[PDB]
Amino acid sequence: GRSSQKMRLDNDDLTIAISGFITNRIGFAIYIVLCVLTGGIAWLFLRWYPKYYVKLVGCATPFRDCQWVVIEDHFNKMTILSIRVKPYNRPLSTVFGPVLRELRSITYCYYKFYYHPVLDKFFCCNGWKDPQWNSMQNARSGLHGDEKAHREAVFGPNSIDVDEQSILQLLVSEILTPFYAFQVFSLILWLCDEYYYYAAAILLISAGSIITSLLETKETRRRLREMSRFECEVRVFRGGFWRTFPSSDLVPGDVYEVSDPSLTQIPADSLLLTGDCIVNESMLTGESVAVSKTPATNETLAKLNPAASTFSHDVDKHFLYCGTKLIRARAAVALVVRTGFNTTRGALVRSMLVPKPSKFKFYEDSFRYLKVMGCLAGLAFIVSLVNFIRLKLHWTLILLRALDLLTIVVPPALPATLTIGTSFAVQRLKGKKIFCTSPQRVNVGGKIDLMCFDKTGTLTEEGLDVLGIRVASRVSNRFTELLTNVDDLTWSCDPLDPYRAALYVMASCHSLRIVDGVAVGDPLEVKMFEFTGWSYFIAGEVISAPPAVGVLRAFDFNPLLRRSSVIARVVGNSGGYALVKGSPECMPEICRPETLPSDFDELLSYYTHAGYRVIACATKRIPKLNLVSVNRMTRDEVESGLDFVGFIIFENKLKPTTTSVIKELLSSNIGTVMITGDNIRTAVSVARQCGIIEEHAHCYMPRFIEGNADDCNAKLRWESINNPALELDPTDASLPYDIRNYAIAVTGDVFRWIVDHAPTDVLHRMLVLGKVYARMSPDEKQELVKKFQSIDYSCGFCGDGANDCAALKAADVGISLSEAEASVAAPFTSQIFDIRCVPEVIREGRASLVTSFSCFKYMSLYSFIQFTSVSFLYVSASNLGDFQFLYIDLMLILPIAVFMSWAGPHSKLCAKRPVSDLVSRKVLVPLLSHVFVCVMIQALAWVAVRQQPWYIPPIVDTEKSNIENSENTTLFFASCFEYILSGVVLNAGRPFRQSPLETWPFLSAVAVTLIATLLMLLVPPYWLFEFMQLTWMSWTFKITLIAFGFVYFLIAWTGEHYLFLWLARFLGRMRQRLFKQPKQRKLYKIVKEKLVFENLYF
Ligand code: ALF
Ligand SMILES: [Mg+2]
């Protein structure tokens, strides 16, 4: 009996291990008695480290006989789940692809593993081919009665119902982290030591942080549950009749109806059987164009695969996805295939909740630093305890002092201070209309090294504009200039006149209807009508000699003929006219070949290759027509024998301010790529116009030369687009084949083949070189972003559709551009709809990163200075007073820390990135030198004060510490002079922020604190003298204290700018030259260097 298994859930990530255990009933008693005895510490310690809990309670057993299982993933986060068993009696094949009895299963992250007995394993994905699907006769007659019920036990309900959790569960999963336990212990220590005010302050700030984080999490999870909760009402063929049911009672096999008008959205992944349908797949592709779907023939059942997760075109022509609108339908039924989380939209939603560890190592490294500091504080506690039992002091004093020395070294207000930079950045972003939801992501904005991009909604207007109109004259059968405008059309001549005929076509060849003074109807007609500027069974001309027209009848656009016609009669002419507009491919089989110019085919190829959509117009004259002829003669006589007029052209025109933002991003050493769902010819042209691809480079793309994507052993040919002769060395490395710049533009079908059957090195080179990525579903967007991240990139995204959701959530920083169905996952949410909020986010990220690092260094220095002062004082059982602590802790550190995080970022993207890690050498090395300088200054001040003739030595006191010394006061003033100047020196400045001379609050706060301290030193009033427990000093010694404080500033400044970085580089070079361990480099750098050098080699 097997009792372990390993699986890979996601596309490539999520390696998990499942094991099965049993409760000992003795370890459980030990655990409960231990919890009772310790009052609650065992519960905490066995919730933080469940490995020992399992080792204490669990006893290993095989899978067949089990009661709960443990699932451990690649990030080492264990979990306890309970196996569920249900009575069930059908053949094994009903559940997979014998007899099955128990039907054991486990649910993990909405995946549902089932237990195969004879193979003795857990299986996640098996499509349930349900072999009845052989003929339309079988598939049309749906399942009857009881057969549904058993299905309900295997597939569950058809509802994407994520599980919400209560407030108390959030609290027990949030507060119980170890740091808050440490904070509670510190608070107990303060209140037991009569040190109230500071404890109350940090309690208030901790409570505020908890409240804001809790509200954040609750709002996020509430919002995510509204994008994935759909409820409709359909009619199903359960028992030979049509019965009305909710959308939740559907199981694979039920045949429902799609022709009814109540049904406005597809309930589940379906397949047509009769009739026809019209849907717009705005959720799978970014476009909003109407798509027509036709019934599935008897052959296509064979190739259907309910688990392929991406369907070929042969079967995609008949598949009705779930969650897509329904424009129009004909007696048409449909057969469901997948329900629940197996649906493409359901699978996307499920993959939006799977956990993924972060590559930003800031907060975790800070916590590791505090843990090392605690390891030091333990030794300090031991030494203090020995030195205190030496002096024969009382026991309460020894305990209290030795324990407060713990909270001195591990400051309980470091994490609550490390968020001020992001807290201040959020409102600047909100002022510039960008709305952030996860503040922890702001720092990540400073690490962006790549920036992906949508096309249709982001880099381009949503609709299709009108570029120009071309016409061929009958004087010479050749085309003319571009004729962008309509005024030129009105004032041009050679329905006999060509230009006026084309204007007539653009004016009255539609079926638009007027609502609210504007026009509605087919999306393409609207743009033409607006371009004309005219008005609308006759079309009224604009006031600003063009005659009006009067329509007698019209044949709308025919799905099979692919054209439309309008028979009208201008008032002037006794005879009528017929205008026909349609696609240029089937046009030649209607019009006269004499009317077709010599430029037809090559000009059509030129326009189509650049990516436009072309439509052609034609005219005809009917010498005699009346009210009886139109009803007597059909469209066949209308169409045949027309006169070619001209081409009208559409264009996906890009937003006015994109070619500048992309140029700036390229000039700031940030690469950019396009990841779109549209064609592979429009995408390349828009990338040429925008600036992603340089104006002179080539664009090689892959083609299938031997076999389609099915065969596991196929060959690829990397051809060129403009010149189909040049190729790339395929087996071989992607290099130009027997020149300076080029860019592979991979389609969306060959990319899957590359990821599957191609070596890793070719994949890496394609990732480094590829600029354009078209014809991709959301899943390929997401896993392409993950592939980018897996070679040490840090990539963002930008999009404005539910198409993009997964790529927005899986990217390091994802900026949305809308407010519906796409801002649920994206951290940020712009509202100006242009790509101008990307530089904003990057700038604020860099400023926030440098600010956070500066604050961390400042708080660490504060901790060390206080520890050194207290360690000097403890050598004689003395201590700082209970109010000097308050002054230092509350009126010097918190105000300077808050105001050090106030200045804004620069007004321009620079060309260099900030340090983005804590355990580095260039961060640690300049910190320990500052610590050394601080300690040296304090030691010098102490030695200096111990030699004056009015010195008042400390007194050892058994009941309480003595505060009125001449050795406490000197260290107090040295510390006060050091805190302010350390805050001034460690400030972030010119490169990624505003220089401190242009920001007033910081300088004002430093000045007021320094003047307060200097006045408290030089001439203090008596109440301060008897209130802070000071002692007399000669006026010649205060000047010496000021001198030490001053010279510390010079030493710290010179070290921080000049010497400390030099020492860091010196130590780094010595380590490299002595320890002979290679320096790791980011992969894409290595691949780029290999590529350029080897290309130069040829
Ligand atoms: F508008 Al798109 F992918 F083309 F969101
Ligand atoms: Mg879009």
User: Which DSSP string corresponds to 220-246?
Assistant: HHHHHTTTT----EEEE-SSSS-EEEE
Best mutation site among 280, 283, 455, 805 for ligand 1, i.e. most ligand atoms within 8 A of its Cβ? 455
DSSP 738-789: ----B--EE-SSHHHHHHHHS-HHHHHHHHHH--EE-S--HHHHHHHHHHHH
The environment of the single-atom ion ligand 2, i.e. residues with CB closer than 5 A, is 286, 454, 456-457, 800-801
* Residues 643 and 591 sit within 8 Å (Cβ to Cβ): yes
Q: How far apart, in whole angstroms, are the C-alpha atoms of residue 125 and residue 305?
A: 12
The alpha carbon of 801 and the centre of ligand 2 are apart by a number of angstroms equal to 5
The phi, psi pair for 682, rounded to 5°, reads -65, -40
The alpha carbon torsion through 823, 826, 827, 828 (nearest 10 deg) reads -60
User: Token pair of 960, please?
Assistant: 């309480």
* Distance, CA of 749 to CA of 752 (rounded, Å): 6
- 800 labelled ligand-binding: yes
Helix/strand/coil for 114: strand
Write the burial class of residue 370 (CB in 10 Å: 0-12 exposed, 13-18 middle, 19+ buried).
buried
C-alpha 456 – ligand 2 centre gap (Å): 5
Q: Is 710 a catalytic residue?
A: no
677 lines ligand 1 (CB under 6 A): yes
Per-residue buried b or exposed e for 164-179, using 16+ beta carbons within 10 Å of the residue's own CB: eeeeeeeeeeeeeeee
Alpha-carbon distance values, 376 to 134, 373, 889, 933 (Å) = 73, 5, 22, 20
Ligand 1 closest atom vs CA 675: 3
How far does the centroid of ligand 2 lie from the alpha carbon of residue 815, in Å?
12
Distance 834 CA to ligand 2 centre (A): 12
779 is in an annotated binding site: no
Helix-strand-coil percent breakdown of the chain, rounded to 5?
40, 15, 40
- Ligand 1 neighbourhood includes 1056 CB (under 6 angstroms): no
CATH of domain 465-651: 3.40.50.1000
Residue nearest ligand 1's atom 5 by CA: 286
Task: Establish whether residue 401 lines the binding site of ligand 1, counting it when its CB lies within 6 angstroms of any ligand atom.
Answer: no
| Nearest ligand, CA 780 | 1
Sign of CA dihedral 995, 999, 1005, 1010: positive
Ligand 1 atom nearest the C-alpha of 462 is 1
Q: Best mutation site among 281, 459, 803, 823 for ligand 1, i.e. most ligand atoms within 8 A of its Cβ? A: 803
Q: Whose CA is nearest to atom 3 of ligand 1?
A: 286
Residue 520 forms beta bridges with which residues? 513
Please name the residues in contact with 311: beta carbons below 8 A apart, sequence gap of 6 or more.
305, 319
Distance CA 200, CA 188 (A): 11
| CA 40 to each of CA 36, 43, 173, 931, 1040: distance values in angstroms, whole numbers, following the listed order | 7, 5, 16, 39, 55
Q: Which ligand is nearest to the CA of 676?
A: 1
The verdict on whether residue 970 carries a ligand-binding annotation is: no
Q: Which residue has the tokens 């692919």?
A: 562
Ligand 1 atom with least separation from CA of 678: 4
In whole angstroms, give the CA distance from residue 831 to residue 808: 16
Experimental method: cryo-EM
Distance CA 350, CA 340 (A): 10
Q: How many other β-carbons are positioned within 10 Å of the β-carbon of residue 533? A: 13
C-alpha to C-alpha distances, 739 to 48, 716, 742, nearest whole angstrom:
58, 21, 7
Contacts of residue 427, Cβ cutoff 8 Å, sequence gap at least 6 = none
Give the contacts of 447 (CB within 8 A, at least 6 positions apart).
Answer: 360, 794, 812, 845, 849, 913, 916
Q: Report CA 695 to chain centroid distance, whole Å.
A: 31
How close is the Cα of 457 to the center of ligand 1, in Å? 5
Give the number of other Cβ atoms within 10 Å of residue 491's Cβ: 10
Q: Are 596 and 616 in contact (CB under 8 A)?
A: no
Contacts of 420 (CB under 8 A, 6+ apart): 855, 897, 898, 901
Resolution (A): 3.7
Query: CB of 456 closer than 6 A to ligand 1?
Result: yes
Q: Encoding tokens for residue 789? A: 């991240």
Indicate which ligand has the atom closest to the C-alpha of 284. 1
Torsions phi, psi of 727, nearest 5? -135, 180
**Residue 13 dihedral angles phi and psi, to the nearest 5°:** -80, -170
Instruction: Give me the phi and psi of 615, to 5 degrees please.
Output: -130, 145
Question: Is the CB of 748 inside a 6 Å radius of any atom of ligand 1?
Answer: no
Handedness of CA 576, 580, 581, 587 (dihedral sign): negative
List, in sequence order, the alpha helices (H) in 287-340: 300-303, 313-316
**Ligand found nearest the CA of 817:** 2
Q: How far is the CA of 420 from the centre of ligand 1 (A)?
A: 36
Is the C-beta atom of 778 inside 6 A of ligand 1? no
Distances (CA, A) of 1075 to 1024, 1063, 1078: 57, 18, 9
Pair 670, 451: CB distance under 8 Å: yes
CA atoms in the 13 A half-sphere facing the CB of 955 = 9
CA distance 415 to 856: 9
Token reading at 142? 């749906």
CA separation, residue 197 to residues 738, 887, 980, 1026 (Å): 79, 11, 22, 20
Q: How many CB atoms lie within 10 A of CB 558?
A: 13
Residue nearest to atom 2 of ligand 1 (CA): 286
One of 454, 643, 678, 812 is an active-site residue; which one? 454
Residue 1046 CA to residue 721 CA, distance in Å, equals 69
Q: What is the DSSP letter of 875?
A: G
The verdict on the CB of residue 495 being under 6 Å from ligand 1 is no
112 token code pair: 């549902």
> Ligand 1: does its nearest atom lie under 6 Å from the Cβ of 269?
no
> CA-based angle 902:904:906, to the nearest 5?
155
- Ligand 1, atom nearest to 676 Cα: 3
Sign of the CA dihedral 237, 239, 242, 247?
negative
Instruction: Kindly give the distance from the C-alpha atom of residue 455 to the centroid of ligand 1, in angstroms, as a whole number.
Output: 5
